[PDB]
Design a protein around this ligand. Structure first.
Ligand code: XVD
Ligand code: R16
Ligand code: C14
Ligand code: D12
Ligand code: D12
Ligand code: D10
Ligand code: D10
Ligand code: OCT
Ligand code: OCT
Lengths: 162, 51
C-alpha cells in the first residue's frame, strides 16, 4: 500500500512544482499588474497587453538569488532525483538501502523550497495592497506533499529492516 | 448696538474619533501574516527532519 503511495506522490509533487514556477501568476499588485517569478506581465498599464522581463539591476548576494531562482528550482531537481530512487524498488530489488537515499532527497527539497520563498518575500518588499495569486499557493503544496512523501519513504525503510 | 446677549469665537471643528473597536485577531499584529505562516511551515519542516 505505502510502496505505491510514494511513486504517485513524486509525480504529483514534481509535476505540480514545475507548474508553480512556470506560470507567472504569483503576486497581484497595483494599474493591476499580476507578478511572477522571472518576469511580470503588466495589465492596465496604458497598454492592452504588455509583458516585459523584470530588471534586478554585501546585499548583492540576495539580488542574484532572486533573479536566478535556483532554490524554487533545486526543489524540483531533488523531487525527480528522489522520484527515480523509489522507482528502483522493482529493478535491482532486495537492496533494502536505496529507499533511504530517497527519504533524504524528499526532505532536502523541502528545505530548499521554504528557502525559495524567504528569498522571494524579503526581495518583494525590498498603502500598496498586494495579494498572493492561485499560482503561488501551488508552491505551498510542493512542500506539504514533500513532507508526507518524506515520512512515507523512510517508514518503509524501517519496516524493511525490521 | 445693545449689550452682547451671547459671546462666541472662532472655534475648531475636527472629525470625532470613533471607538475604533479592535479586530478579533488584533493580537496577531506585532508579527506579519508572512511571519506566522513561515513559522508554521518551519515548524512542520523541523519536525519531519527531527523524525
Ligand atoms: O514554492 C513555495 N513553497 C511554499 C511554501 C509555503 C507557501 C505559503 C502558503 Cl502555502 C500559504 C501562506 C503563505 C505561504 O508562504 C509564506 F512564506 F509562508 F508566506 C508558499 C510556497 N511557495
Ligand atoms: C490564508 C487566510 C488568512 C486569513 C486572515 C484573516 C485575518 C482577519 C483579521 C481581521 C478579522 C476581523 C473579524
Ligand atoms: C544576470 C541574469 C542571469 C540569469 C541566469 C539564469 C540561469 C537559469 C538556469 C536554468 C537552468 C535550467 C536547467
Ligand atoms: C510561460 C509559457 C508557457 C505557459 C503555460 C501556461 C499553462 C497554464 C496551465 C494552467 C493549469 C491550471
Ligand atoms: C530566462 C530563461 C528562463 C528559463 C526557465 C526554464 C525553467 C526550467 C525548469 C526545469 C525544471 C526541471
Ligand atoms: C512543463 C514540462 C517541462 C517543461 C520544461 C522541459 C525542459 C526544458 C529545459 C530548458
Ligand atoms: C494571520 C493569519 C494566520 C495566523 C497563524 C497563527 C499561527 C500561530 C502558531 C504558529
Ligand atoms: C505514517 C503517517 C505519517 C503522517 C505524517 C504527516 C506529517 C504532516
Ligand atoms: C490560515 C492559517 C490557518 C492555520 C490553522 C492552524 C495551523 C496550525
Amino acid at each position: 500500500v505505502q510502496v505505491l503511495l510514494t511513486t504517485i506522490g513524486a509525480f504529483s509533487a514534481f509535476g505540480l512544482m514545475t507548474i508553480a514556477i512556470s506560470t507567472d501568476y504569483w503576486l497581484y499588485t497595483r494599474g493591476l499588474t499580476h507578478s511572477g517569478l522571472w518576469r511580470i506581465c503588466c495589465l492596465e498599464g496604458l497598454k492592452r497587453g504588455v509583458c516585459v522581463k523584470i530588471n534586478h539591476f554585501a546585499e548583492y548576494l540576495l539580488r542574484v538569488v532572486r533573479a536566478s531562482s535556483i532554490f524554487p528550482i533545486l526543489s524540483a531537481i531533488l523531487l525527480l532525483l528522489g522520484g527515480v530512487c523509489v522507482a528502483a524498488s522493482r529493478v535491482y530489488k532486495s537492496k533494502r538501502n536505496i529507499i533511504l537515499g530517497a527519504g533524504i532527497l524528499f526532505v532536502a527539497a523541502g528545505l530548499s523550497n521554504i528557502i525559495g520563498v524567504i528569498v522571494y518575500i524579503s526581495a518583494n518588499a525590498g498603502k500598496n495592497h498586494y495579494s498572493y495569486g492561485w499560482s503561488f499557493y501551488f508552491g505551498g503544496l510542493s512542500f506539504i506533499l514533500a513532507e508526507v512523501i518524506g515520512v512515507l519513504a523512510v517508514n518503509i525503510y524501517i519496516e524493511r529492516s525490521r | 448696538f445693545s449689550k452682547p446677549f451671547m459671546s462666541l469665537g472662532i472655534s475648531i471643528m475636527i472629525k470625532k474619533p470613533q471607538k475604533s473597536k479592535p479586530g478579533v485577531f488584533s493580537f496577531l499584529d506585532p508579527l506579519a501574516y508572512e511571519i506566522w505562516m513561515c513559522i508554521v511551515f518551519a515548524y512542520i519542516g523541523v519536525s519531519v527532519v527531527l523524525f
